[PDB]
Design a protein around this nucleic acid. Structure first.
Lengths: 56, 57
DNA sequence: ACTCTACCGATAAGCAGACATACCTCTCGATCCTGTGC
RNA sequence: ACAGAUCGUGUCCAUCGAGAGGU
């Protein structure tokens, strides 16, 4: 559909990030800031993007 | 006379009741477990049973 | 008349994908570091 | 000019696996 889903939109050029409610922080016994796997994956993606930009 | 044995299952360790108790974090749905004041789960089978009953409200 | 080889249809046979009743109860462990620094 | 000690209410310790269970 030319309005809602164009064929060229299947290629990722701007990846949105979920809000903190989607990936909350796990308090866990004793004061440690355990984080969700989604946050770690987003950080990994950001690091890869920064490395690619610097390398280019 | 007949030999009888007492099992580990007692009614004191199985009775549970919840009314607006502790709250979760991610799903914002009632917690699970008698020890942490959990709530019973309204499963899918109960959903289709209620649907067949016609009780939409 | 069917040789010299092309696309039509019609199968065989191997390559992976999805998933297995429902309810709750309890206990028990693990959630990093070694090469490298002056 | 003005320019505070806490007080008062306070939210929980989570996740992932493994095992034993009972209708």
């Amino acid at each position: 559909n030319e309005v809602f889903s164009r064929p060229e939109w299947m290629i990722l050029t701007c990846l949105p990030v979920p809000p903190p409610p989607v990936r909350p922080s796990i308090s866990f016994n004793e004061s440690q800031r355990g984080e969700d796997d989604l946050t770690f994956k987003l950080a990994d993606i950001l690091k890869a993007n920064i490395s690619l930009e610097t390398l280019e | 006379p007949t030999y009888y044995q007492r099992l580990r299952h007692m009614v004191d360790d199985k009775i549970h009741a919840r009314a607006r108790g502790p709250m979760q974090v991610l799903t914002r749905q009632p917690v699970e477990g008698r020890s942490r004041d959990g709530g019973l789960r309204f499963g899918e089978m109960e959903r289709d049973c209620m649907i067949a009953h016609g009780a939409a409200s």
